[PDB]
Design a binder for this molecule. Structure first.
Ligand SMILES: CCCCCCCCCCCCCCCCOC[C@H](COCC(F)(F)F)OP(=O)(O)OC
Ligand SMILES: [Ca+2]
Length: 131
């Protein structure tokens, strides 16, 4: 679920404010996405977008979960380490992992303030054929 993704990000990145820091960043961090990712961090979001695209096509997710942000999963956080609990079913596990990988990627990528609140209509034209 969305509140869990925010929580995973805070686990991986102590002191972060997910909605302020990552939502609406670059071409892919936020609802939707297009163009070529402007940087490593943006590529993390493109990858997460793709992961959610894949999740929607998973058998265990197909009709039960149309929007992964409404699907809660089981996880734990310890010393900035994220764990997707085994109790998760196929659909819940896939989503948790998408979020977990995204959170880690975010924590290891440089943060470019000038890529925040990007004018996507001017800098995100076209479509990246990735993932
Ligand atoms: C609007 O929701 C879109 C979502 C917002 O993520 C911000 C969060 F705070 F949860 F990190 O962006 P998305 O591209 O799905 O993932 C970064
Ligand atoms: Ca996106």
């Amino acid at each position: 679920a969305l509140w869990q993704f925010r929580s995973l990000i805070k686990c991986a990145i102590p002191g972060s404010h997910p909605l302020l820091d990552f939502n609406n960043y670059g071409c892919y961090c936020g609802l939707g996405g297009s163009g070529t990712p402007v940087d490593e961090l943006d590529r993390c979001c493109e990858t997460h977008d793709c992961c959610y695209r894949d999740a929607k096509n998973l058998d265990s997710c197909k009709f039960l979960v149309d929007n992964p942000y409404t699907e809660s999963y089981s996880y734990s956080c310890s010393n900035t380490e994220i764990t997707c609990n085994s109790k998760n079913n196929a659909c819940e596990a896939f989503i948790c992992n998408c979020d977990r990988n995204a959170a880690i990627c975010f924590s290891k990528a440089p943060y470019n303030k000038e890529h925040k609140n990007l004018d996507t209509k001017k800098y995100c034209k076209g479509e990246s054929d990735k993932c």
